[PDB]
RNA sequence: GGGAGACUGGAAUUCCUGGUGUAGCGGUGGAAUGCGCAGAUAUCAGGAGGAACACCGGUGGCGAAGGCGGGUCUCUGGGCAGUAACUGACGCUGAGGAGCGAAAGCGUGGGGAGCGAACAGGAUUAGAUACCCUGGUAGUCCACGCCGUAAACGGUGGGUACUAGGUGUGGGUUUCCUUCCUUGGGAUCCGUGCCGUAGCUAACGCAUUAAGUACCCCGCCUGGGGAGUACGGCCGCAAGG
């Protein structure tokens, strides 16, 4: 199939990973 | 000194050629490089620069008493052909031609591919 | 093509001691000759390669003279 | 009790007339271990393909033994420990 | 091996103790034990010369045979492996065939009932002692002498080994555990194999009590001292000393080996740091 | 695997008669001997996972054979289990 | 160098002969046209109608084997087994020059190796085993053409 | 070249030492950082150390999958063929569950030649947190353990029976040309490719190694985003799953 779907999925996963990197310490302090 | 018989080591890389005449016990007696004959940068990767370096090394060995020599080529082909032709053309007799290139038996990791 | 001189009824055994039978199978540079240029079967080619390597290990054949 | 073939290369300086007796003593252990049979052949003073331990010539000896694997390993250890043995190589004359 | 204490108490949380698996006897030989009393780090004048010493559990000295030069040609049988408090390594009790008992530091892999021989005709099994001239190059040795007769001095700690590189002339080039390369006369005897108890360094001592039992007084930092006591002392609040680091007697950091020692000619290359 | 003599002695001791080799008793005995040998081997080489898979296959086959025996005749199953020490 | 191809990518350098790599290269052309003594002009005429760039003959005055070839813009060039001056060489009218180097002594495999590592259209040499002249050239099928007496 | 352990071989790279030896070497599309003139590069001799095993070597072998080739020894798993002596349906699948599971990554202890995230400069560019160049730490390696993910793909779950052929190639049995040397050819069993009927498909294509004709069992899908995300829970040192 076309790689457009894979592009959407990788963008979503990348954004989630960046969010996790940004809030790692806050999650640890609240967890 | 006077060394009637010696060896010639030619290392022709992709961007330079180095020619060295050697007393057969392994002692360099006269060497000429591609950049030593007035070339610099990519200009010294040309076969003409190899010709000039080989001729200069041949003269710098000839006045030292070298008459007959045997050549050990080495390196990817840039100016080896012209190097040996110039070694002959400068009055230096060529005894034998030997291709001794360091060939690993798949050892060490080569650098990553360019793009 | 060519003949696997070992699959024949007169096929001499392959050993790392008999150096001439191996020298006839390596090129002048000492490299092991290909199977097609020789024509022997796969098992005999593998046995020849193993014998050549062993003979090199025991200093009976040069390592690329 | 399996059959083995041990090829040894010794330095050329030592006299050949002592190679056969000395090697004999080296097999004595494997002779007294489990009732083993030996066949010794010597074709030495042949120049090596490449330099081994600052040497160009070497004495080649072939020993056909029929013994236990532990005994052969112990014999190989002793042979490698000896300073007059340049190299040893052990093969199995069985299907392997 | 290493046995880790369960975190039942705050003093035992991260603690661990050596699992004395190789020890085969809980008592030493009565004829090989000499009295030993603690000095406290104080020399013949009664003044403290080495700080952070004193206290600690009382211990006795087991006479170790670092000079195995008499029993050449006499085989010995390892009778036991015991615990020596004066050293990190474990000691093995030998029973020579003539009827004499001796103590040696147990090499790596030595087991009860093994046969230990010595001399020029000895084998190259671990535990055997023979002069460096008869030891083939490349092997691993320990308890090496420095002069032909002075006894073992080098590679005596636990898990420590010396790699014999090669012999030339009358000198053998050894790679010390520090990585330093030194030459030594070939007449010096050596023992084959690594030293046992290699896992001892992985011990976590848990609390200050263990160190106090081992005989180590607390060590006070220099920046919490006063300027009369230490060069780093003084200042309001915490400080770094306000001066390049120095010993309590003012000697600055750097090389302290005295130059032009007579042994400088026998050192091939010194150890290296930060490589 | 086992040598010919070990197989012969196991078959003679556990076989129903002097000829059978595929009887479930003989198969279970041979599998148990192989399993104990493989366990003794694996106690030295802990990281030999492929032989561990082979051991798992042998264990499963022995369990299936014991299931068949217990389904056909209970007394034979009890006798075999008690004779081979086979826990189950 | 070889990976990937584009419109302006450098065209592959192809020799005149069919490749026929060292594997089964062989020597399947052995001419022995003429060894009757000739002079320089006669050798040049024997060159011209044969349409061959080089030609191996035996010289009149010397009695030695020699090879003539086109010396390029300099004219023609003559190579002898042992270099001799023009005076000993038989009289001629064509403008030629003599190669000062002598034909060396070397084996068959060494000759093939020298030809490969020296890239000349041919190699003229005194064979080690034979002791006589020989000219090897890469043929038009990839094999080496060894011309012998 | 199925797996584990032990010992060991050579070429080559790097570094060190000692000769000969000079003014450049290196690098690129072109250069500059960089190295060298305190003696570099080159050449010879010696030494140390680590990693990977040129030729054999392929759409060829083994393995359930990941994956697996320098040599020798020890231990060990699986497969195929023939005889059909033996047991006599003991078979298939398998919710959960357990085990194995590329690389990257984590912990403890070692090792560290080459390569090399990060990080420095050099260069290109309007801008270069990049592509190219010079250096280079983790890491890549070993031992014991963790994690449990991949375009982990043949994007094709496992077992069985049947349905035109033709031709390569691996392994094993046998009849006839018969020299019996020979891929002689035939027959047959087990793999591994290519082309092609019927048939199937939306088409591309698959086509005896089915994506054809049918039977047994399991897993999975119900428009695209939100989202394999939030909450809750389990596992994990952590990343995270």
Short mmCIF file of C-alpha atoms in Angstrom, two decimals, chain E residues 19-264:
data_model
loop_
_atom_site.label_atom_id
_atom_site.label_comp_id
_atom_site.label_asym_id
_atom_site.label_seq_id
_atom_site.Cartn_x
_atom_site.Cartn_y
_atom_site.Cartn_z
CA UNK E 19 30.58 -16.47 50.25
CA UNK E 20 33.45 -18.52 51.65
CA UNK E 21 32.95 -21.42 49.24
CA UNK E 22 36.62 -22.33 48.80
CA UNK E 23 37.31 -22.39 52.55
CA UNK E 24 37.60 -26.02 53.68
CA UNK E 25 38.65 -25.50 57.31
CA UNK E 26 37.77 -22.97 60.01
CA UNK E 27 41.05 -23.14 61.97
CA UNK E 28 44.70 -22.51 61.08
CA UNK E 29 47.71 -24.72 61.68
CA UNK E 30 48.89 -24.15 65.24
CA UNK E 31 52.57 -24.55 64.33
CA UNK E 32 52.43 -21.91 61.56
CA UNK E 33 50.67 -19.12 63.51
CA UNK E 34 52.64 -16.23 65.02
CA UNK E 35 51.39 -13.50 67.38
CA UNK E 36 50.30 -10.18 65.94
CA UNK E 37 49.26 -6.97 67.71
CA UNK E 38 47.95 -3.79 66.17
CA UNK E 39 50.16 -0.73 65.91
CA UNK E 40 47.46 1.91 65.44
CA UNK E 41 49.45 3.64 62.72
CA UNK E 42 52.05 4.87 65.23
CA UNK E 43 55.78 4.40 64.70
CA UNK E 44 58.65 3.83 67.16
CA UNK E 45 58.31 7.39 68.49
CA UNK E 46 54.65 6.80 69.35
CA UNK E 47 53.58 9.51 66.88
CA UNK E 48 50.86 8.91 64.31
CA UNK E 49 52.52 8.44 60.91
CA UNK E 50 49.68 6.74 59.00
CA UNK E 51 46.28 8.22 59.77
CA UNK E 52 42.92 6.43 59.75
CA UNK E 53 44.30 3.32 61.46
CA UNK E 54 43.52 1.69 64.79
CA UNK E 55 40.89 -0.48 66.40
CA UNK E 56 39.71 -3.46 64.44
CA UNK E 57 39.33 -7.14 65.22
CA UNK E 58 42.33 -8.89 66.72
CA UNK E 59 44.13 -11.16 64.26
CA UNK E 60 47.04 -13.59 64.16
CA UNK E 61 49.74 -14.07 61.54
CA UNK E 62 50.05 -17.22 59.43
CA UNK E 63 53.62 -17.73 58.23
CA UNK E 64 53.38 -17.68 54.42
CA UNK E 65 56.10 -19.36 52.35
CA UNK E 66 57.04 -16.70 49.80
CA UNK E 67 60.48 -18.29 49.29
CA UNK E 68 59.76 -21.80 48.01
CA UNK E 69 63.35 -22.63 47.08
CA UNK E 70 64.19 -25.58 49.37
CA UNK E 71 61.66 -28.21 48.26
CA UNK E 72 62.72 -28.61 44.63
CA UNK E 73 61.89 -32.12 43.47
CA UNK E 74 59.59 -32.80 46.44
CA UNK E 75 55.89 -33.00 45.64
CA UNK E 76 53.26 -31.46 47.90
CA UNK E 77 49.55 -32.19 48.34
CA UNK E 78 47.08 -29.40 49.01
CA UNK E 79 45.45 -30.36 52.31
CA UNK E 80 43.15 -27.40 52.97
CA UNK E 81 42.22 -23.87 51.93
CA UNK E 82 41.86 -21.41 54.79
CA UNK E 83 41.02 -17.78 55.47
CA UNK E 84 43.91 -15.39 56.11
CA UNK E 85 42.88 -12.02 57.63
CA UNK E 86 46.23 -10.37 56.81
CA UNK E 87 45.65 -10.55 53.04
CA UNK E 88 42.82 -10.49 50.52
CA UNK E 89 43.80 -13.83 48.98
CA UNK E 90 43.13 -17.23 50.53
CA UNK E 91 45.94 -19.49 51.72
CA UNK E 92 46.43 -23.20 51.00
CA UNK E 93 48.04 -25.72 53.34
CA UNK E 94 50.57 -28.03 51.68
CA UNK E 95 51.68 -31.47 52.87
CA UNK E 96 55.12 -32.15 51.44
CA UNK E 97 55.99 -35.80 50.92
CA UNK E 98 58.82 -35.55 53.47
CA UNK E 99 56.39 -34.58 56.24
CA UNK E 100 56.59 -30.77 56.29
CA UNK E 101 53.62 -28.41 56.24
CA UNK E 102 53.76 -24.92 54.72
CA UNK E 103 51.46 -22.04 53.80
CA UNK E 104 51.12 -20.53 50.32
CA UNK E 105 48.58 -18.14 48.86
CA UNK E 106 46.01 -20.21 47.01
CA UNK E 107 46.14 -19.64 43.23
CA UNK E 108 43.02 -19.44 41.12
CA UNK E 109 41.36 -22.81 40.58
CA UNK E 110 43.45 -24.73 43.13
CA UNK E 111 41.46 -27.51 44.77
CA UNK E 112 41.94 -29.77 47.78
CA UNK E 113 43.90 -32.92 46.99
CA UNK E 114 45.88 -31.43 44.10
CA UNK E 115 49.57 -32.26 43.68
CA UNK E 116 51.95 -29.29 43.83
CA UNK E 117 55.51 -29.64 42.54
CA UNK E 118 58.36 -27.17 42.24
CA UNK E 119 61.74 -26.75 40.60
CA UNK E 120 63.08 -26.60 37.07
CA UNK E 121 61.49 -29.98 36.27
CA UNK E 122 58.02 -28.97 37.49
CA UNK E 123 54.98 -28.84 35.22
CA UNK E 124 53.14 -25.65 34.23
CA UNK E 125 49.98 -26.44 36.15
CA UNK E 126 48.68 -23.66 38.42
CA UNK E 127 50.33 -23.60 41.83
CA UNK E 128 53.76 -24.83 40.74
CA UNK E 129 56.80 -22.68 41.53
CA UNK E 130 59.79 -22.59 39.18
CA UNK E 131 62.38 -20.03 38.06
CA UNK E 132 61.36 -17.63 35.31
CA UNK E 133 63.94 -19.12 32.93
CA UNK E 134 61.98 -22.39 32.77
CA UNK E 135 58.54 -20.75 32.41
CA UNK E 136 57.50 -20.47 28.74
CA UNK E 137 56.69 -16.98 27.50
CA UNK E 138 53.08 -15.85 27.34
CA UNK E 139 51.90 -17.68 30.47
CA UNK E 140 50.25 -16.02 33.46
CA UNK E 141 52.13 -16.07 36.77
CA UNK E 142 51.90 -14.54 40.24
CA UNK E 143 53.99 -14.05 43.38
CA UNK E 144 57.05 -12.96 41.41
CA UNK E 145 60.37 -12.07 43.01
CA UNK E 146 62.43 -8.96 42.30
CA UNK E 147 65.94 -10.29 43.00
CA UNK E 148 67.14 -13.90 42.81
CA UNK E 149 66.41 -14.98 46.38
CA UNK E 150 64.48 -12.12 47.95
CA UNK E 151 61.12 -13.89 47.83
CA UNK E 152 57.83 -13.14 46.11
CA UNK E 153 56.95 -9.44 46.03
CA UNK E 154 54.75 -8.76 42.99
CA UNK E 155 51.21 -9.94 42.18
CA UNK E 156 50.14 -11.10 45.62
CA UNK E 157 46.67 -9.54 45.87
CA UNK E 158 43.40 -11.35 45.22
CA UNK E 159 42.51 -12.03 41.60
CA UNK E 160 45.79 -10.44 40.52
CA UNK E 161 48.01 -11.89 37.81
CA UNK E 162 51.21 -11.07 35.93
CA UNK E 163 51.57 -11.74 32.19
CA UNK E 164 55.07 -12.85 31.18
CA UNK E 165 55.78 -11.27 27.80
CA UNK E 166 59.19 -12.60 26.79
CA UNK E 167 62.76 -13.34 27.77
CA UNK E 168 65.92 -11.82 26.33
CA UNK E 169 69.46 -12.08 27.63
CA UNK E 170 69.26 -12.48 31.40
CA UNK E 171 66.09 -10.39 31.75
CA UNK E 172 62.40 -11.24 31.43
CA UNK E 173 59.90 -8.49 30.59
CA UNK E 174 56.79 -8.66 32.77
CA UNK E 175 53.49 -6.78 32.48
CA UNK E 176 52.52 -5.78 36.01
CA UNK E 177 48.88 -5.61 37.15
CA UNK E 178 49.18 -1.82 36.98
CA UNK E 179 49.97 -2.14 33.26
CA UNK E 180 53.58 -1.09 33.83
CA UNK E 181 56.21 -3.11 31.96
CA UNK E 182 59.39 -4.03 33.84
CA UNK E 183 62.40 -6.27 33.30
CA UNK E 184 63.59 -8.77 35.90
CA UNK E 185 66.38 -11.33 36.10
CA UNK E 186 65.47 -14.80 34.83
CA UNK E 187 66.75 -16.46 38.01
CA UNK E 188 63.75 -15.09 39.92
CA UNK E 189 61.19 -17.77 40.76
CA UNK E 190 57.50 -17.43 39.98
CA UNK E 191 54.26 -19.30 40.64
CA UNK E 192 52.00 -20.33 37.77
CA UNK E 193 48.39 -19.15 37.59
CA UNK E 194 46.27 -16.28 38.82
CA UNK E 195 45.57 -15.66 42.50
CA UNK E 196 42.23 -16.87 43.82
CA UNK E 197 39.39 -14.96 45.48
CA UNK E 198 39.00 -12.77 42.39
CA UNK E 199 35.42 -11.77 43.28
CA UNK E 200 36.42 -10.26 46.64
CA UNK E 201 36.55 -6.69 45.30
CA UNK E 202 32.79 -6.71 44.54
CA UNK E 203 31.93 -6.69 48.26
CA UNK E 204 29.62 -3.93 49.48
CA UNK E 205 30.44 -3.29 53.13
CA UNK E 206 27.06 -1.75 53.97
CA UNK E 207 27.89 0.32 57.04
CA UNK E 208 30.71 2.00 58.94
CA UNK E 209 30.71 -0.90 61.39
CA UNK E 210 32.34 -3.26 58.91
CA UNK E 211 35.15 -0.79 58.20
CA UNK E 212 35.65 -0.21 61.93
CA UNK E 213 35.97 -3.98 62.38
CA UNK E 214 38.51 -4.00 59.54
CA UNK E 215 40.53 -1.31 61.35
CA UNK E 216 39.82 1.99 59.57
CA UNK E 217 39.18 5.16 61.54
CA UNK E 218 36.96 7.86 59.98
CA UNK E 219 38.58 10.22 57.48
CA UNK E 220 37.79 13.94 57.83
CA UNK E 221 37.65 16.13 54.73
CA UNK E 222 40.08 19.03 54.49
CA UNK E 223 37.60 21.79 53.68
CA UNK E 224 35.82 21.34 57.03
CA UNK E 225 39.14 21.88 58.84
CA UNK E 226 40.65 25.04 60.12
CA UNK E 227 43.52 26.85 58.36
CA UNK E 228 45.91 25.83 61.14
CA UNK E 229 45.01 22.16 60.56
CA UNK E 230 44.84 21.95 56.76
CA UNK E 231 45.74 24.21 53.83
CA UNK E 232 42.18 23.74 52.54
CA UNK E 233 40.56 24.86 55.79
CA UNK E 234 38.82 28.09 56.70
CA UNK E 235 36.16 30.12 54.98
CA UNK E 236 32.53 31.05 55.62
CA UNK E 237 30.21 28.33 54.39
CA UNK E 238 31.24 25.49 52.12
CA UNK E 239 34.27 26.08 49.92
CA UNK E 240 36.66 24.27 47.58
CA UNK E 241 39.71 25.31 49.60
CA UNK E 242 40.33 28.45 47.55
CA UNK E 243 43.65 26.99 46.42
CA UNK E 244 44.96 24.21 44.21
CA UNK E 245 44.55 20.80 45.91
CA UNK E 246 47.34 19.83 48.30
CA UNK E 247 48.17 17.27 50.96
CA UNK E 248 47.62 18.23 54.63
CA UNK E 249 51.35 19.03 54.76
CA UNK E 250 51.16 21.35 51.75
CA UNK E 251 52.77 19.18 49.08
CA UNK E 252 50.96 19.83 45.78
CA UNK E 253 49.54 17.10 43.58
CA UNK E 254 51.64 15.51 40.87
CA UNK E 255 54.34 12.89 40.38
CA UNK E 256 56.20 11.99 43.57
CA UNK E 257 58.45 9.12 42.44
CA UNK E 258 62.02 10.19 43.13
CA UNK E 259 63.83 10.69 39.81
CA UNK E 260 67.00 8.81 38.86
CA UNK E 261 66.23 5.80 41.01
CA UNK E 262 68.61 2.89 40.31
CA UNK E 263 65.62 0.85 39.10
CA UNK E 264 64.69 3.31 36.34
#
